[PDB]
Each structure stands twice: as structure tokens, then as C-alpha cells.
């Protein structure tokens with residue numbers, strides 16, 4: 662049973678806690694790191710790349726679109742499927758996510774299993 666490697670970057674620690682637990686329990690998903698802001702995920706993104714990055718747009722110090730733009734310029738996005746997560750679903754923002762190479766965009770709140778199903782779409786095979 663092959664595991665899709667997932668990383669999470671979000672500044673709501675209770676969501677990161679819950680979501681890491683839920684995704685790990687899935688047979689085809691392995692959560693390999695979590696970060697609470699944009700700087701920390703970039704530190705981690707050096708050296709260690711997931712198949713899927715769950716990425717909150719609104720974050721202290723360094724936000725989701727900044728991370729996405731840095732990762733697109735470092736050729737990370739060829740491997741990494743980035744799924745933007747946010748309650749700020751403004752139409753120009755999405756457009757930026759698209760230009761900066763996001764695979765997907767999801768609104769908070771979301772059903773966990775519906776997010777699982779999108780992880781399997783962007784990174785699952787057979």
C-alpha cells in the first residue's frame with residue numbers, strides 16, 4: 662500500500678493537530694512534516710519534499726502565495742502538488758494561485774474526506 666507524502670502549513674495549530682491525525686490514519690497517506698508559517702515550511706522544503714503540500718494563504722511573517730512563488734522559482738512544483746487552503750476565497754487570489762502553480766484550491770470549512778479525495782486525485786495513481 663503505497664503512501665502519498667503530505668506536508669501541512671497552517672497557523673491554526675488545532676487544525677494542524679486534527680488534520681495530521683486524520684490524514685495519517687488514511688492507508689494511502691503519510692504526513693511527513695507540519696509548519697506554522699511560510700518561513701518554516703520553506704526551511705523544511707529545502708532537503709525534504711512532499712508529494713502534496715496543504716498550504717494556508719493567510720499566515721504570519723510569510724504567507725501562502727509567497728511560499729508558492731518561492732517554490733515555483735526553485736523548481737519544486739514539478740514534484741509538489743500544492744493545495745491552497747483558506748477561508749479567504751477571493752477570485753483574484755485564486756488567479757494568483759493558478760499563475761504561481763497551485764494544483765488545487767479549497768475553501769474552509771471543508772469536509773476532511775473530500776480533501777482526502779482531492780489528495781488522491783492530484784497524487785494518487787492506480
Ligand SMILES: [Mg+2]
Pocket residue numbers: 672673717718719720
Ligand atoms: Mg490562516
